[PDB]
Design an enzyme around this catalytic site. Structure first.
Site, mmCIF file in Angstrom:
data_model
loop_
_atom_site.group_PDB
_atom_site.id
_atom_site.type_symbol
_atom_site.label_atom_id
_atom_site.label_comp_id
_atom_site.label_asym_id
_atom_site.label_seq_id
_atom_site.Cartn_x
_atom_site.Cartn_y
_atom_site.Cartn_z
ATOM 1 N N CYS A 79 0.830 -1.193 0.000
ATOM 2 C CA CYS A 79 0.000 0.000 0.000
ATOM 3 C C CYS A 79 0.874 1.257 0.000
ATOM 4 O O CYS A 79 1.558 1.546 0.987
ATOM 5 C CB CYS A 79 -0.923 -0.029 1.228
ATOM 6 S SG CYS A 79 -1.968 1.414 1.456
ATOM 7 N N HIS A 114 -8.846 -4.582 -2.659
ATOM 8 C CA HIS A 114 -7.981 -3.733 -1.856
ATOM 9 C C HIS A 114 -8.276 -2.252 -2.122
ATOM 10 O O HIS A 114 -8.295 -1.438 -1.193
ATOM 11 C CB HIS A 114 -6.522 -4.055 -2.171
ATOM 12 C CG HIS A 114 -5.538 -3.166 -1.481
ATOM 13 N ND1 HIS A 114 -4.632 -3.636 -0.555
ATOM 14 C CD2 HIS A 114 -5.292 -1.840 -1.611
ATOM 15 C CE1 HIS A 114 -3.869 -2.640 -0.146
ATOM 16 N NE2 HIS A 114 -4.248 -1.540 -0.770
ATOM 17 N N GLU A 115 -8.518 -1.907 -3.384
ATOM 18 C CA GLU A 115 -8.807 -0.526 -3.730
ATOM 19 C C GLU A 115 -10.186 -0.059 -3.288
ATOM 20 O O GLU A 115 -10.335 1.061 -2.799
ATOM 21 C CB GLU A 115 -8.667 -0.316 -5.230
ATOM 22 C CG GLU A 115 -7.242 -0.442 -5.727
ATOM 23 C CD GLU A 115 -6.253 0.323 -4.868
ATOM 24 O OE1 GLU A 115 -6.543 1.484 -4.499
ATOM 25 O OE2 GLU A 115 -5.178 -0.238 -4.568
ATOM 26 N N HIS A 123 -10.360 1.138 0.060
ATOM 27 C CA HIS A 123 -9.923 2.527 0.178
ATOM 28 C C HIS A 123 -11.046 3.556 0.049
ATOM 29 O O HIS A 123 -11.057 4.547 0.776
ATOM 30 C CB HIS A 123 -8.859 2.864 -0.871
ATOM 31 C CG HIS A 123 -7.461 2.525 -0.459
ATOM 32 N ND1 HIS A 123 -6.944 2.862 0.773
ATOM 33 C CD2 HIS A 123 -6.459 1.910 -1.131
ATOM 34 C CE1 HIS A 123 -5.684 2.469 0.844
ATOM 35 N NE2 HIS A 123 -5.366 1.888 -0.299
HETATM 36 FE FE LIG Z 1 -3.273 0.719 -0.256
HETATM 37 NA NA NA Z 2 -2.416 -4.789 -3.059
#
Ligand SMILES: [Fe+3]
Ligand code: NA
Ligand code: NA
Length: 186
Positions: A113, A156-157, A160
């Site tokens: 990250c 993962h995004e 965010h």
């Molecule tokens: Fe990240």
């Molecule tokens: Na990643």
């Protein structure tokens, strides 16, 4: 002689762990897309690609990455970009997971990250497979099935744009705990 202009994401533009912006739930983008949201998208993809080319990454002092979210640039909008070397290279506006496999998976080496500098031990359990819905820079709406790595990057995004960091999935006291038959990618 020279056409138009654009900006380039520099490492300083990427905020770090602790910045409250990384914890807000990003706002939904309005359609049709503004020329500002379209530009940001492009700036985000150029970055990922740039960070992956040895020469550019080096000359531009960039840390390689395959995924990026607007919040990381301190822009609380539901916009993400992914560029996975040969396979998946696009910007997603208002992305949303519509379904997932029962089968789970994780990156054996651990997720990265650009926003965190500390090293965080553990495994982050994700859905092996997902189906994502979103809008591209054209305004076209898409629905695609992703698996393994690409599925992990996208999950993962999206975390965010929901104020979620990868280490939130890691049991601080049992970092490498895994159920049976979890696909560990590496
Ligand atoms: Fe990240
Ligand atoms: Na990643
Ligand atoms: Na910028």
């Amino acid at each position: 002689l020279v056409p138009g202009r654009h900006m380039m994401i520099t490492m300083d533009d990427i905020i770090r762990e602790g910045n409250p912006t990384l914890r807000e739930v990003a706002k939904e983008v309005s359609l049709p897309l503004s020329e500002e949201d379209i530009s940001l998208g492009k700036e985000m993809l150029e970055f990922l690609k740039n960070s992956q080319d040895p020469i550019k990454a080096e000359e531009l002092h960039l840390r390689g990455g395959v995924g990026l979210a607007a919040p990381q640039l301190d822009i609380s909008k539901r916009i993400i970009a992914v560029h996975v070397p040969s396979s998946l290279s696009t910007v997603m506006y208002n992305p949303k997971i519509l379904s997932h496999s029962v089968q789970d998976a994780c990156l054996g080496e651990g997720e990265g990250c650009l926003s965190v500098d500390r090293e965080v031990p553990g495994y982050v359990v994700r859905h092996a497979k997902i189906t994502v819905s979103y809008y591209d820079m054209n305004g076209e709406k898409h629905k695609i099935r992703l698996k393994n790595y690409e599925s992990i990057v996208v999950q993962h995004e999206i975390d965010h744009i929901n104020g979620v960091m990868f280490y939130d999935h890691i049991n601080d006291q049992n970092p490498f705990a895994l159920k049976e038959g979890v696909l560990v990618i590496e």
